[PDB]
Amino acid sequence: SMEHRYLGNSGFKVPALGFGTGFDVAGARRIIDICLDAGVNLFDTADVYSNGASESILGAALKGRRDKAIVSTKLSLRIGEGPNDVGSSRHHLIAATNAALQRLDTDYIDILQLHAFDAMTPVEQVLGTLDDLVRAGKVRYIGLSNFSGWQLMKSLAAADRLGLQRYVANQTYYSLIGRDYEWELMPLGIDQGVGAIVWSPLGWGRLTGKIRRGFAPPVDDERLYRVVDAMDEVALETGKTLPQIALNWLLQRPTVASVLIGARDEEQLMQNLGALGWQLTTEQVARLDAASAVTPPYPYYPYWNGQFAERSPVAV
Amino acid sequence: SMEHRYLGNSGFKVPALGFGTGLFDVAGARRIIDICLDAGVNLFDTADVYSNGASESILGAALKGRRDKAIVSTKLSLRIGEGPNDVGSSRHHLIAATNAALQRLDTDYIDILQLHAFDAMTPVEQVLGTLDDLVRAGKVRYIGLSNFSGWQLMKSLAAADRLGLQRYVANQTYYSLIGRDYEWELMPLGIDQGVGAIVWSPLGWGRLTGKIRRGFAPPVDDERLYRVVDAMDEVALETGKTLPQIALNWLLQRPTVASVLIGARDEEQLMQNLGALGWQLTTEQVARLDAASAVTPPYPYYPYWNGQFAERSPVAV
Amino acid sequence: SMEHRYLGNSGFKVPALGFGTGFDVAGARRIIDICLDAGVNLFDTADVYSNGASESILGAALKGRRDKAIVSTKLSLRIGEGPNDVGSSRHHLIAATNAALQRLDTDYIDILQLHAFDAMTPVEQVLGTLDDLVRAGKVRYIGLSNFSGWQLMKSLAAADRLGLQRYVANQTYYSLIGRDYEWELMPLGIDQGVGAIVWSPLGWGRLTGKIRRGFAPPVDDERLYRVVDAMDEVALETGKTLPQIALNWLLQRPTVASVLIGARDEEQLMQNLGALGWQLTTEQVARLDAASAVTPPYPYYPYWNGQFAERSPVAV
Amino acid sequence: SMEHRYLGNSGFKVPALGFGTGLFDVAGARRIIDICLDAGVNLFDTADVYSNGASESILGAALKGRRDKAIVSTKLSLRIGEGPNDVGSSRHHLIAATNAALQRLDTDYIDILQLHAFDAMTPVEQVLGTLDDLVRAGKVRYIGLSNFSGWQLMKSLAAADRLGLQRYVANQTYYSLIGRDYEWELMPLGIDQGVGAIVWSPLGWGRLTGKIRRGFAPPVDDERLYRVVDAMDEVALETGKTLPQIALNWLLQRPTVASVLIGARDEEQLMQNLGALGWQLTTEQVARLDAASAVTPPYPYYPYWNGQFAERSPVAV
Amino acid sequence: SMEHRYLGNSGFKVPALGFGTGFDVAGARRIIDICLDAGVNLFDTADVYSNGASESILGAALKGRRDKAIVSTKLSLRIGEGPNDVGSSRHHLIAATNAALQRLDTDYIDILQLHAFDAMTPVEQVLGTLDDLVRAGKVRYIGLSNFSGWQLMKSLAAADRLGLQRYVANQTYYSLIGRDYEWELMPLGIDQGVGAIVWSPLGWGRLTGKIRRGFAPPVDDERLYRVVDAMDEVALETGKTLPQIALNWLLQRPTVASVLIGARDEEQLMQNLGALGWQLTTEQVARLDAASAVTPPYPYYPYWNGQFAERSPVAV
Amino acid sequence: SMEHRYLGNSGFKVPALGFGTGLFDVAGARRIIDICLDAGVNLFDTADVYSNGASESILGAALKGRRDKAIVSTKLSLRIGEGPNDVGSSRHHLIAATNAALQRLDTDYIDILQLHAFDAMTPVEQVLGTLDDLVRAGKVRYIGLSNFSGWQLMKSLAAADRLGLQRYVANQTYYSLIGRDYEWELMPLGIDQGVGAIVWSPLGWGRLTGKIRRGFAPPVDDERLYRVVDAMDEVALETGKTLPQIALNWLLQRPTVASVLIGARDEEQLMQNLGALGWQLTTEQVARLDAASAVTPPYPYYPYWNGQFAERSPVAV
Ligand SMILES: [Cl-]
Ligand SMILES: [Cl-]
Ligand SMILES: [Cl-]
Ligand SMILES: [Cl-]
Ligand SMILES: [Cl-]
Ligand SMILES: [Cl-]
Ligand SMILES: [Cl-]
Ligand SMILES: [Cl-]
Ligand SMILES: [Cl-]
Ligand SMILES: [Cl-]
Ligand SMILES: [Cl-]
Ligand SMILES: [Cl-]
Ligand code: NA
Ligand code: NA
Ligand code: NA
Ligand code: NA
Ligand code: NA
Ligand code: NA
């Protein structure tokens, strides 16, 4: 049975596992149906995924069942050659939102996320445009991806001050080999009620077990192998697969509302659902955390090493 | 001659080099103050935790009779006693500690009062209210912080603006050629919000002195340090400047940097540090130093720094 | 002739007696017609009353006369098995309001009330969604049911601060045997202009006279019998029935704007209308109050017993 | 060793046990203060109405020379004289009474100033403005209240936030195993809004001492009291702790509780109360005590406490 | 040629003379046409004027030329027997505005005015409802009639504070024999940019010359005759009629943006237009003011008699 | 025994009868203060213009040693000198005049400071800011006004609320049986906005004394005065009370009236005025007096008072 979680402080619930189209019409309908049957009813896409084709294919697959789905999409990355075919200025946000609705073949999007930070458009303007889309019924909830801590906080404070809609979802990279989310974005999310929707949870296929002795730093072989060693040890104790361990570990982390998985078929979906219904023990998590730990940058370092932890403890 | 810079967007000017009591003999201290003031190094930085208050007392004694010629920067909020309220930024400790610092410094006001760390246990609205009251009372002119996350500093600045309270204008930050993490969040926030950097440990805890060659900061990997020193040596050949002078000058070319805190035991050491002024590393020399010191940015900065998302959100350096 | 009262500070008037569907098409039309003829033109329902059938039946009965009715409905209780088929988050509020409009077969609701407090959704979001529904013309007035004093006050303060619509109606349990409304909710209602629409005024059939020597505490037999004794004594003086006394008592209480009654036919409606056109005397009310009095909880106790009453008197 | 807790969301720490002068011989009072301070019981609570001001005067005399080692909590707004303005929270009385308390206490500031009851005759905006002015003047560090309804406290907190004034951080509340009404409104409000409880009459006016066995609070029914004492006796067998120690420890496990006020005439009595610290009632022991002490919640709490509406609005205990 | 004036601080211009329907389809069209030809293109009506028939007749007469007219209407007085067929609460304001639009047979009203003060509805709610009507395009400008000074100021301050539309027109009784507008409402109008649209400018036919030796106090014969004497003297100097003098006097008074006149035919309209194109002299106005002066009430009295005039002069 | 009333919504209580120095020999003044205080008449009203400051000086001397037992009400803003700034409510004059009054009164604070007239030449936002500063400084407890139009008072109250400043709680108004104009605007505004009336010239400048029988206020027509006196005589027969006692009692039954200012040269006169207390004119007696004193309301009040628009906006009396 699918577990459901609150998306930040929004009061809206998402399934703990979602389907990341980061996409044969019959095949797409089948994937949607096996997902829906399993309770995986969050579907995530973006305008840039295959130049709009991912949204169109999703829309076509959901047609007839869209009311059973939570549709998450992203915009603001460059999607054309024109000088205004990019960013978060009012012109592009309006045009891109309408274009996504057309491709998805629906009258509303459940979660609309800005795909990157546009420093060239004032956050007050962006939030006004998003608020208007929400009030018009085109969007229910809003979120973001790839913002700095300060940029997200700036936006949340502006929304509150202006009485506009606030971000409730952060589409973030987070995995055992990519724990950077923990430094700024996680404690911000805790403080401000922003829930994480996690992508590349296997660190771009690196935590599958296949490997053994654009958005993320390449990972050093030695560190990867140390993490895989620890996962192997846990796999022996638990009988679970490396992907199931990676996912189970994420689901225990603060703020995590949903983790986006891939599923080409029933068998793959079932493997991923094997992340649910059990829990890594405290000791197992501690072992995985020790193996995956990296030196925190300044200014997090003296909090993480205990010096300033008294008055500002770390969440993990 | 001393160069002066605006401290963030405050309209207040500080000397490009300041004197960090993080060194401190009343006569000896007066003598150091004398040579600093003579050179235009009239920013003096201290903290309650420096020798359990003795640094502030010594500084106060050294400045007596001429305090008006100095810019006094002090820090509080770190644990300064064994009591449950001898720490943090709650109203009780902020008031008590500010008054205690004024008593030790033997003055009626502090030019720049900085919170030494982030106290997550006190609401930023309360902290800012307390600081605003101290400023309005004439006890403090300007306020700042040290060791805040990007989000924590932004949360505080937004609250100050919303409530009509004083805003932070100074970030006392670690920044050096071997410790460039300030660049990821804090620098671009400082640019956006008018917060100037007062830089400490500019030589990366003595590592950029030239002495080394082939708990606030990660320990530095030998191989990286040596690569940075190699690049500094090459620049030293062109410029004729010392490694410390290059390290300091490099900092002085970075966005937001208003002052760099140096140590000076005597005239000769002060003069060596003053050699960081009166010249500028060239674009090419800075690029060479940046290439040698570059580290892989964490997520979510990575795709902006590698160019993928740079179009609409360029990096400052 | 029907008496009418202001609904809190709203400037909107309701009949002193309303029809609580807490529901034969001809029969329903007849009930509506006898109610309308008597001036009982407030009809109260909820999505959960018979899984939507109460709203549908009301809608069908009012068709042709809806402009003569004040329609009150409630939502936010669990109405389906889905993770978002409950609560006050934007998704459910919008979907449920539209669903109620469809069942009621009308384009607007006079009074929309939140049926319980949803601690999982920020009150600022809830109020924004309600404000949007009001501005769209779908709802005229808003209210609540079953909030704590602090929760209702939090919501009223947020509405005022944000310039949004405020609650004007509290659908509350209140009766001679259930006087808890008096501790927090009544004095809040007085202070903030929120009028009570009273349900279960006979304490779930316990004040009918039939008994003699989910939402409310069960009542102790001895206390019930003491209240019934006092009602019997008043019935001897007045010649009125126990239900008429119970209703007349409620109608004298501060904040009470309407009391919801049941009416299966003309005879039952007429009995209830017998609550109007006369008044319990001061002495009779005092006798009923003494019999029904219960020890107030902390912190109300020292105000009610006179210790702190000087500067903060009790409303009854 | 004394345990310390945050007072609501304020960032200020209080000892988990405090000394309630609601007991008070200047030498005798100094002696009690000495033993309290030695044990870390450095919160002292008083009120203008305690012996018509004599309690505050005695406390002030007892603290003289070491007031800086104490956290002084005082209450005002109850009738303290026969005059028409010798009562309430209007500006006239609040100012006069605060200054009078400062004079009696022989100090320049009060750590926690609490309104003793709700004054419906004065607008909360006025009250909060007066309190904000006293805080800004340095006369008061933190503010609180006692005996407010849920709606009254929330109204005040919302007004403070809206107006940028000081907010209440302490609720001086009656709470005990036999008086759990604090749980219905005031506890969940305290959780939501960062108000910490300072608990008074923790033994339910001497009823939870073990002395009894088979005007702020309802009198308690004998049968209920005896059921609660039975459960305490069972826990006493497991833990080896006294009934008062169990009652105190139980309170210390409840959400929002920052400090519990106790009485101590001498070292031995103080030591008995300190036996509430250094251990914790287990989940099961708390559940047993809660089951014995449980009462039927009033409307509108009832359907949340019985599970009907609990899904979206759970109860804190 | 018609003179035009700014309506308070609104930037909107009205003709100095307007047509007050306070109303033969051909006859109505003719009256409208002669008015339009003369530049009298402000038409004022109300729901209560002949129980809606005045609005309907105006609408029918304007059909085909409505874009050349400025339509002013009033609502909030009791217009039916129902408990909510009156006042300024959201229910009635919305229903009445839509009903007026239907009767007038147009999609917008230029100036919508509240006909009296409704103390039972919060001004914040009233202003919100009016703001919504303006934003929807149903109303361009808003105003009021028959408010106390304090009530109008309360409403203006609330509008400004909440960022809502403010009143720009005060439909006021003002005439040589009814100068009470001068005490509170005129200096408020000056201070806050509210322009007067003047009704009963002849004091209900009393300043026509026919008389000689619900809303307004009856006038004492002796005072009326003294005013008529002064008008007669001015009529001798000027050669103008008494109505022309009365109107010319009003048009010189501070805040006056338009004066509503009656016109049954070309001849009557032409008589009224004779108020324009000349000016009473300073001396003539002073003579008329002296004859019409009444003792100001407290607290205006010590300002009007010069005692407190230094720091707070009177506008006339 | 003295009756006390809340001053508007302020939560502050005043005696139902106060002493108007608008009478004022230091010993003589002390004696009058003594008899007033003995009777509970402890509100003393004065103004800078009363005998060019001498009234305030005499009052200050009369209260010395016991000022804490009095409520001091004073007025400023009328012309008090020949200088261009010796008048009005601009910051210069308000500050200077308030300080001058404090000096004359020989006290550190004024209980109720009232603007004596409306200064249209100074923005109400400025006036309220100045008054707020005086209150925050502890120089003034409560503020009020006199002789404002309805719109001017409302404009000021709205500005105070919007800006978070002190609001007016007292309206020093003329009100009497023969001068009921207060009822049109100022009374219903006072009800709506929590402003209490302190009534002056309650006998209509000696006209309601019984002495007459068959520049703030219009002169009164003889015929009307005589009709009012006739009705008072009839009530005097029923009640046994004097005409002044009836006039005062009538005022005490009107909405918003918190205090009525009376004159008292000695014990006997004070006792006569105190005869207004301890009883109440009946509904019928008030109706009889109201019918005799009724005047035609101006526009726009007329259609509300005559019933036409009364449904949705009833009149308070
Ligand atoms: Cl939200
Ligand atoms: Cl992956
Ligand atoms: Cl600044
Ligand atoms: Cl260094
Ligand atoms: Cl409302
Ligand atoms: Cl019932
Ligand atoms: Cl706080
Ligand atoms: Cl106890
Ligand atoms: Cl405008
Ligand atoms: Cl007329
Ligand atoms: Cl007030
Ligand atoms: Cl008089
Ligand atoms: Na939430
Ligand atoms: Na830009
Ligand atoms: Na109302
Ligand atoms: Na905190
Ligand atoms: Na009050
Ligand atoms: Na001016």
From TrEMBL, chains A, C, E:
Organism: Polaromonas sp. (strain JS666 / ATCC BAA-500)
Protein name: Aldo/keto reductase
